[PDB]
Structure formats: C-alpha cells, structure tokens
C-alpha cells in the first residue's frame, strides 16, 4: 500500500528499488501498459488509491522523486480535478 | 591579467626544443606543492572509477517533472 503513514522508509526504498529494476529491464510504456490495465486495478488500488489525496500526493511525488514521473500523471489529473 | 594572459597563451604554443651546440640550457618552470597531491590522487581515483557515456550534449529530452506537492 502506497501510504506514507503506515509503510516504512525501508519499504519505500524497497518499492523504489524494485520499480527501478522493473523500469530498467523492461520498458516504461510497457510498464504503464502493465500498470494501467483494468483487471489488475483491484490489485493496484493498494498502490493507487486515488483517495485521501495527501496519499495521492505522496504517490505522485514518490514516483516522480524515484526518477520516473509519468506513472502518476493519471493521479496528477485526479488531484487536479478532485 | 588580460595582458598577462595574452602573454600566457603567447607562450603556450608548441615551441619545440632547439638543437643546441653542446649541452642544452635549462630554463625555469609549476603548481601547488604542499598537500595538493593527496587530493590529486583522490580525484585521480575518482576519474579512473567514474564513467559516463554519450556526448557532452546529452542533457536533451528531459521532461523535468516537478513535484506537485500540497497546495
């Protein structure tokens, strides 16, 4: 769960390193295709809540501060219109 | 300093040594001696270890996503 209240700093660093190896060994448009399919959004809603929008802000700034950006542009426009 | 610099790359040319009749004549010199060779070896190891690829014009195609943060 991408929640800054509950997850540890080690958990955030772990998720950052895991997603960095994902973005290295396979492409980022392919990663967005793997991450934006509707079937795994019941399993992505822990990662992508789009609710309690300071956690959405944490997810946006986390996937930007890893070095990616991009993956939370949908969360960025969610934060814009909500 | 601009006049001295004009003299400095007036001096800084190829300027091959002249073939001398007999022994050649020694000329004057240098850099900073006390302590500087330790940092010279430190950044020598740093330059020998650190590496990058692409040309010097390689900062292009950067979207530069900023943090949206809290309003």
């Amino acid at each position: 769960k991408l929640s800054e209240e509950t997850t540890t700093s080690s958990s955030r660093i772990f998720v950052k390193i895991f997603f960095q190896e994902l973005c290295e060994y396979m492409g980022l448009p392919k990663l967005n295709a793997r991450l934006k399919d509707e079937t795994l959004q019941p399993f992505f809603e822990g990662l992508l809540p789009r609710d309690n929008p300071r956690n959405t802000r944490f997810a946006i700034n986390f996937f930007t501060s890893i070095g990616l950006g991009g993956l939370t542009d949908e969360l960025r426009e969610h934060l814009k219109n909500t | 300093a601009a006049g001295e610099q004009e003299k400095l790359e007036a001096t800084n040319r190829y300027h091959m040594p002249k073939e001398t009749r007999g022994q050649p004549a020694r000329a004057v010199d240098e850099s900073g001696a006390p302590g500087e060779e330790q940092r010279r070896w430190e950044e020598a190891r740093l330059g020998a270890a650190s590496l990058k690829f692409g040309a010097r014009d390689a900062a292009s195609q950067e979207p530069k996503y900023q943090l949206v943060l809290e309003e």
Binding site: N61, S65 | L69
Partner: peptide
C-alpha cells in the same frame, strides 16, 4: 550496529526527506 542501521536508514535515499527538501524549496 543498530545505530549504523538507523544512520544508513536516515542517510539513505529517503523519499520523505526528499519531500521535505522539495517542499521547503517550494515554500522558500
């Protein structure tokens, strides 16, 4: 070495420390 453990965890990548740094850069 739990002191070195938490020192590495505080001098690590630390995304929340990056958010504090960027939020203070934006507020300043």
């Amino acid at each position: 070495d739990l002191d070195r453990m938490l020192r590495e965890q505080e001098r690590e990548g630390d995304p929340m420390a990056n958010f504090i740094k960027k939020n203070k850069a934006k507020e300043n």
